[PDB]
């Protein structure tokens, strides 16, 4: 998790399973 | 004589604030590491060509350099731009001036405007008849040459005048060393920092 | 991108022009921005 | 190391193409169901992740 | 399709049944409360009186030019006049000129034969277009012309003709000859207004009044002819003295400097997000729940 | 032999001169004072 | 392919027409040739 790193109608939806559920 | 420009002669290309961004822009910039013709006010101020535009700079301790002339013929056949510092204001005029045989500042017209220890830096260009002036001042540790580092010139002045230029000449105070580098149509990538300041560029 | 319109900014066309010609300029932006989205969605379907 | 999902983007194509303009949005309707099938495709990708 | 969120769902699906699920039906968007109109506080009326009522215009080979700046231009005073035989505008509409601002305006003034008025347009070709007065193909301006027989006929031979905006003063020059004996052969006066939209502060503006300034609240706006919408706020974006706008990656405006007090305003688009309708099937219930995506519940 | 002909035909039965095997300085025509209109539809007169 | 331009040879358009009309003919070729690459690159992404 440490080693892997808006108004124009573009959006990001959250995943169903949180990183704490994974 | 000659010297090398290093990363000199970069300016804000438009009157738009940008920050924390790498912006690709195409404009008349001074090419990095170009040879710039170099001159002394001691042991002259010849007429130079202007080409597409000029980075003009001087390393100074005396304020002997005090202005410039621009035009095509520089001989009263046609209108010529004049720029002067009177030690309280910049002064600008365009007229069919009859200049001297060896013009200096003492120790028909269509436009007017009014407002080593140091390095004073300028960029001059004509686009669509707009004569644009950019400038910066800096302290210097080296007498011989331009500093091998980066700083972006801000626009001082923009004249609506529509006058053709192919030649120019600096003005010296009479009864200092200076550098002339021509601009070229270059694509630059400009590094605008958090405080919206150009702090590096890629030629 | 202009896509051939007089400006890249939709509010320039709508503040400078009027309906006989504003629609001619906006159809160049609609065509280009629609083709820009179809290219993204196609490459996201292949990447998915 | 294996990738298993990617960011669930969705793009509001009426606001991307015609950002808060009714003048443009009434022209974008003349292209029919392109904007609704772009949303359908990006929703299908996002549910798949 | 606007009664309730289930009816938006039915319409989004083009279906009267909705199956169980979550459906993005719409975008929530907080609407502009009011319009804020903002322009420079200068009030000189522009010298169009001098331009259109001069005693003599120039020859088309040596056309006259005037630069107009630091002033207010009511273009309807020109456009409403019955005098003008043509007023054709390129890159602008003459209805919109009063809503708008430019950094400079240039008036180009000259006399031609009435048949040749056709050649004063962007992208034209012929002896006046190519050898006397050429407009660029990206021209942003208005061409304003009228027959001037009462001013410029006598005959009169003082007007002559032989490169975008060139003044091409050996001499290939030929005079016109203007008499009441000349309609297309008559002298026409023409003024071309060219508008400068370059990246600098406005100095020519339409007569439209400025409003007070509103902040931390969603408004429609027009700053120096830059129309838009957003929550304006005071800002810590450190504009240098020459900068007048800030821009986004999408080329859209992100900040402005007020033309009346020179403080820096952020522009934030008014609060928005996807609206998703959570539903059991319509076979189970007409009850729904609504998810406003990417908003805090106090901002809905 | 066309532009300086003494007479021109009636439009029910117009002339049709063949020009061939020759050098054509069309700028002599295009820069002539004589012509009230000179309109080209798949070429530009400067290019000829 | 012409795509609606007077000729598909780009040098015909550039040698026969002056810029106000040449750019109208060339943009039909840019529109069609760009669509012809977007088609090929999409087929190669699916075939890859």
Chain F residues with CB within 8 Å of chain G CB: 42-44, 46-47
- Structure token pair of residue E160: 């002559």
Eight-state DSSP code of residue C29: H
Distance CA G29, CA G22 (A): 11
Q: What is the 3-state secondary structure (H, E, C) of chain B?
A: CEEECCCCCCECCCCEECCCEEEEEEEEECCCCCEEEEEECCCCCCCEECCCEEEEEEEECCCCEEEEEEECCCCCCCCEEEEEECCCCEEEEEECCCCCCCCCEECCEEEEEECCCEEEEEEEEEECCEEEEEEEEEECCCCCCCCCCCCCEEEEEEECCCCCCCEEEEEEEECCEEEEEECEEEEEEEEECCCCCEEEEEC
- Number of H-type helices and E-type strands within chain F: 1, 0
- Who's near E77: CB < 8 A, 6+ residues apart? E48
- Physical contact, D and E (3 or more Cβ pairs within 8 A): yes
- Who's near E248: CB < 8 A, 6+ residues apart? A7, E254
Cα within 13 Å of Cα(E11), Cβ side: 10
- Structure token pair of residue B4: 């090398």
Closest by CA to C42, choosing from G46, G32, D19, is G46
Distance CA B66, CA B91 (A): 11
Q: Which residues of G touch F42 (CB under 8 A)?
A: 6, 16-17
Q: Which residues of A touch D19 (CB under 8 A)?
A: 8-9
Closest by CA to E84, choosing from E184, E188, E226, is E188
**Is E242 within 8 Å of B12 when comparing Cβ atoms?**
yes
- Structure token pair of residue E120: 């004063």
**Using an 8 Å Cβ cutoff, are E32 and E218 in contact?**
yes
Query: Phi/psi at D3 (nearest 5 deg)?
Result: -70, 145
Closest by CA to E42, choosing from E195, E196, E206, E199, is E206
Cα within 13 Å of Cα(E177), Cβ side: 3
Interface test with F, best of E123, E124, E125, E127 (most F CBs within 10 A): E125
**Is G18 within 8 Å of E137 when comparing Cβ atoms?**
no
**Is C26 within 8 Å of D34 when comparing Cβ atoms?**
no
Eight-state DSSP code of residue C6: S
- Structure token pair of residue E161: 């003709």
Distance CA E101, CA E210 (A): 13
Distance CA E18, CA E10 (A): 6
Q: Give the gap in angstroms from C-alpha F13 to the nearest C-alpha of chain G.
A: 30
User: Distance of alpha carbon B4 from its chain centroid, rounded?
Assistant: 16
| Cα–Cα distances in angstroms (integers) from residue E84 to residues B68, E148, E238, in the given order | 46, 10, 48
Distance CA B64, CA F15 (A): 79
- Looking at the DSSP bridge assignments, the partners of residue E292 are E275
Subunits with 3+ Cβ pairs within 8 Å of C are D, E, G
- Number of H-type helices and E-type strands within chain A: 0, 1
Distance CA G22, CA G40 (A): 27
- Who's near F10: CB < 8 A, 6+ residues apart? none
- Physical contact, B and D (3 or more Cβ pairs within 8 A): no
- Looking at the DSSP bridge assignments, the partners of residue B124 are B54, B133
- Who's near B108: CB < 8 A, 6+ residues apart? B79, B95, B96
Cβ–Cβ contact C43 with G under 8 A? yes
Name the burial class of residue G12, with classes exposed (0-12), middle (13-18) and buried (19+) by CB atoms within 10 angstroms of its CB.
middle
Cβ–Cβ contact E67 with B under 8 A? yes
Name the burial class of residue E226, with classes exposed (0-12), middle (13-18) and buried (19+) by CB atoms within 10 angstroms of its CB.
buried
Cβ–Cβ contact C42 with G under 8 A? yes
Name the burial class of residue A15, with classes exposed (0-12), middle (13-18) and buried (19+) by CB atoms within 10 angstroms of its CB.
middle
Closest by CA to B8, choosing from B24, B30, B28, B23, is B30
Number of neighbours of residue C31 by Cβ within 10 angstroms: 16
Conformational region of residue E251, where left means phi above 0, alpha means psi within -120 to 50, and beta covers everything else: left
Q: Give the gap in angstroms from C-alpha D47 to the nearest C-alpha of chain C.
A: 11
Q: Give the gap in angstroms from C-alpha A4 to the nearest C-alpha of chain D.
A: 12
| Cα–Cα distances in angstroms (integers) from residue B74 to residues B97, E116, G16, in the given order | 8, 38, 43
Name the burial class of residue B184, with classes exposed (0-12), middle (13-18) and buried (19+) by CB atoms within 10 angstroms of its CB.
middle
**Using an 8 Å Cβ cutoff, are E129 and E119 in contact?**
yes
Locus of tokens 């704490």: A20
Q: Which residues of C touch E100 (CB under 8 A)?
A: 15-16
Contacts 24+ apart (CB under 8 A), G18-25: G18/E125, G18/F44, G18/F46, G18/F47, G19/E123, G19/E137, G20/E122, G20/E123, G20/E137, G21/F44, G23/E137
**Is E27 within 8 Å of D14 when comparing Cβ atoms?**
yes
Distance CA E118, CA E125 (A): 10
Distance CA B57, CA B36 (A): 10
**Is E240 within 8 Å of B16 when comparing Cβ atoms?**
no
In chain E, which among 118-137 make CB contacts under 8 A with chain F?
125-126
- Who's near G43: CB < 8 A, 6+ residues apart? none
Number of neighbours of residue B101 by Cβ within 10 angstroms: 4
Subunits with 3+ Cβ pairs within 8 Å of F are E, G
Cα within 13 Å of Cα(E42), Cβ side: 18
**Is C48 within 8 Å of D42 when comparing Cβ atoms?**
no
**Rounded (5°) CA angle B23-B27-B32:** 85
Q: Which residues of E touch G18 (CB under 8 A)?
A: 125
Handedness of CA E174, E146, C13, E215 (dihedral sign): positive
Paired sense of beta strands E204-205 and E71-72, if any: parallel
Q: Which residue of D has its CA nearest to E230?
A: D20
| Cα–Cα distances in angstroms (integers) from residue G23 to residues B13, D43, E129, E265, in the given order | 28, 40, 19, 40
Closest by CA to E72, choosing from E211, E212, E241, E210, is E210
- The string of DSSP letters for chain E reads --SSHHHHHHHHTT-SS--SEEEEEEEEEPPP-SEEEE--S--PBPTHHHHHT-S-PEEGGG-EEEEE-SEE--THHHHT-TT-SB--EESS-TTTGGG-EESEEEEEEEEEEGGGGGGSSTT--SHHHHHT-BPPTT--EEEEEEE-HHHH---B---EE--BT--------EE--B-TT--TTSEEEEEEEEEE-SSS---EE-SPPPPP---SSEEEEEETTEEEEEEEEE------TT--EEE-TTS-EEEEE-SSS--EEEEEPPSEEEEEEEE--TTT-S--EEEETT--TTT-
Among C4, C35, C42, select the one facing G42 at the smallest CB separation.
Answer: C42
- Who's near E280: CB < 8 A, 6+ residues apart? E20, E287
Closest by CA to E102, choosing from E76, E79, E122, E72, is E72
The H or E element spanning position G38 is: helix G19-47
Locus of tokens 């043509």: E86
Q: Give the gap in angstroms from C-alpha G32 to the nearest C-alpha of chain F.
A: 21
- Structure token pair of residue D24: 């443009």
Q: Which residue of F has its CA nearest to G19?
A: F44
Distance CA B20, CA B195 (A): 8
Distance CA B41, CA B61 (A): 12
Closest by CA to E48, choosing from E82, E72, E80, is E72
Distance CA B143, CA E244 (A): 37
- Physical contact, G and C (3 or more Cβ pairs within 8 A): yes
Chain D residues with CB within 8 Å of chain C CB: 6, 9, 11, 13, 16-19, 21, 23-24, 27-28, 31, 34-35, 38, 41-42, 45, 48-49
Distance CA E109, CA E59 (A): 9
Number of neighbours of residue C40 by Cβ within 10 angstroms: 16
Q: Which residues of A touch D16 (CB under 8 A)?
A: 8-10
**Using an 8 Å Cβ cutoff, are B154 and E242 in contact?**
yes
| Residue D9 three-state SS | strand
Closest by CA to D30, choosing from C23, B96, E172, is C23
Experimentally, the structure was elucidated by cryo-EM
- Structure token pair of residue E155: 């005959």
In this structure, what is the dihedral angle of CA atoms E91, E93, E96, E100, given to the nearest 10 degrees?
Answer: 20
Q: Which residues of F touch G16 (CB under 8 A)?
A: 42-44, 47
Angle in degrees, 0-180, between the axes of helices C19-47 and G19-47, rounded to the nearest 10 = 20
- Structure token pair of residue B152: 């972006």
Cβ–Cβ contact D39 with E under 8 A? yes
Q: What is the CA radius of gyration of chain E?
A: 28
- Topology (CATH) of B2-203: Jelly Rolls (2.60.120)
Distance CA E5, CA E11 (A): 10
Subunits with 3+ Cβ pairs within 8 Å of A are D, E
- Looking at the DSSP bridge assignments, the partners of residue E77 are none
Q: Which residue of A has its CA nearest to D15?
A: A9
**Using an 8 Å Cβ cutoff, are E291 and E22 in contact?**
yes
**Using an 8 Å Cβ cutoff, are E144 and E78 in contact?**
yes
Distance CA E146, CA E183 (A): 11
- Structure token pair of residue C47: 């990447």
Angle in degrees, 0-180, between the axes of helices D34-48 and C19-47, rounded to the nearest 10 = 20
| Residue C23 three-state SS | helix
- Structure token pair of residue B65: 């350099």
Eight-state DSSP code of residue A14: P
Distance CA E130, CA E172 (A): 13
Across D1-49, where does the E strand assignment appear?
Answer: 8-11
Distance CA B56, CA B121 (A): 6
| Cα–Cα distances in angstroms (integers) from residue C8 to residues B22, C3, D18, G16, in the given order | 20, 8, 12, 31
| Cα–Cα distances in angstroms (integers) from residue E59 to residues E65, E141, E142, E160, in the given order | 12, 21, 20, 5
């Amino acid at each position: 998790f440490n080693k892997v790193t808006k108004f124009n109608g573009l959006t990001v939806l959250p995943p169903l399973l949180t990183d704490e559920m994974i | 004589a000659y010297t090398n420009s290093f990363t000199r002669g970069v300016y804000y290309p438009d009157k738009v604030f940008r920050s924390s961004v790498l912006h690709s822009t195409q404009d008349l910039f001074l090419p990095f590491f170009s040879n710039v013709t170099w001159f002394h006010a001691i042991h002259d101020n010849p007429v130079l060509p202007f080409n597409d535009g000029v980075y003009f700079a001087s390393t100074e301790k005396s304020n002997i350099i005090r202005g410039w002339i621009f035009g095509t013929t520089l001989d009263s056949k046609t209108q010529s731009l004049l720029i002067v510092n009177n030690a309280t204001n910049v002064v600008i005029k365009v007229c069919e001036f009859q200049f001297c045989n060896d013009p200096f500042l003492g120790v028909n017209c269509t436009f007017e405007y009014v407002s080593f220890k140091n390095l004073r830096e300028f960029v001059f260009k004509n686009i669509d008849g707009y004569f644009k002036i950019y400038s910066k001042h800096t302290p210097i540790n080296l007498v011989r040459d331009l500093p091998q580092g980066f700083s972006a010139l801000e626009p001082l002045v923009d004249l609506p005048i529509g006058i053709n230029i192919t030649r120019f000449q600096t003005l010296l105070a009479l009864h200092a060393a200076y550098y002339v580098g021509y601009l070229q149509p270059r694509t630059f990538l400009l590094k605008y920092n958090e405080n919206g300041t150009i702090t590096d560029a890629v030629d | 991108s202009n896509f051939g319109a007089i400006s890249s900014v939709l509010n320039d066309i709508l503040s400078r022009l009027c309906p006989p010609e504003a629609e001619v300029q906006i159809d160049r932006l609609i065509t280009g921005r629609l083709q820009s989205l179809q290219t993204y969605v196609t490459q996201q379907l292949i990447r998915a | 190391i294996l990738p298993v999902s990617m960011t669930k983007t969705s793009v509001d194509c009426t606001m991307y193409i015609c950002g808060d303009s009714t003048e443009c949005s009434n022209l974008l309707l003349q292209y029919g169901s392109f904007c609704t099938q772009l949303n359908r495709a990006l929703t299908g990708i996002a549910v798949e992740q | 399709c606007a009664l309730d969120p289930l009816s938006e769902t039915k319409c989004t699906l083009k279906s009267f049944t909705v199956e169980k699920g979550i459906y993005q039906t719409s975008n929530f968007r907080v609407q502009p409360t009011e319009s804020i109109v903002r322009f420079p506080n200068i009030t000189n009326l522009c010298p169009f009186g001098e331009v259109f009522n001069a005693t003599r215009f120039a020859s088309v080979y040596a056309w006259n030019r005037k630069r107009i700046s630091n002033c207010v231009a009511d273009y309807s005073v020109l456009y409403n006049s019955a005098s003008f035989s043509t007023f054709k505008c390129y890159g602008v509409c003459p209805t919109k000129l009063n809503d708008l601002c430019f950094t400079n305006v240039y008036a180009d003034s000259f006399v031609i034969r009435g048949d040749e008025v056709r050649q004063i347009a962007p992208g034209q070709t012929g002896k006046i277009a190519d050898y006397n007065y050429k407009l660029p193909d990206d021209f942003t301006g208005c061409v304003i012309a009228w027959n001037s027989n009462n001013l410029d006929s006598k005959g009169n031979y003082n007007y002559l003709y032989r490169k975008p905006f060139e003044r091409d003063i050996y001499f290939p020059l030929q005079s016109y000859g203007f008499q009441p004996t000349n309609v297309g052969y008559q002298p026409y006066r023409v003024v071309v207004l060219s508008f400068e939209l370059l990246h600098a502060p406005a100095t020519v503006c339409g007569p439209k009044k400025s409003t007070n300034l509103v902040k931390n609240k969603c408004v429609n706006f027009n700053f120096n002819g830059l129309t838009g919408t957003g929550v304006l706020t005071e800002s810590n974006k450190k504009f240098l003295p020459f900068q007048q706008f800030g821009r986004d990656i999408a080329d859209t405006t992100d900040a402005v400097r007020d033309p009346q007090t020179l403080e820096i305003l952020d522009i934030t688009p008014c609060s928005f997000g996807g609206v998703s309708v959570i539903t059991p099937g319509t076979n189970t219930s007409n009850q729904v729940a609504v998810l406003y995506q990417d908003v805090n519940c106090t901002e809905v």
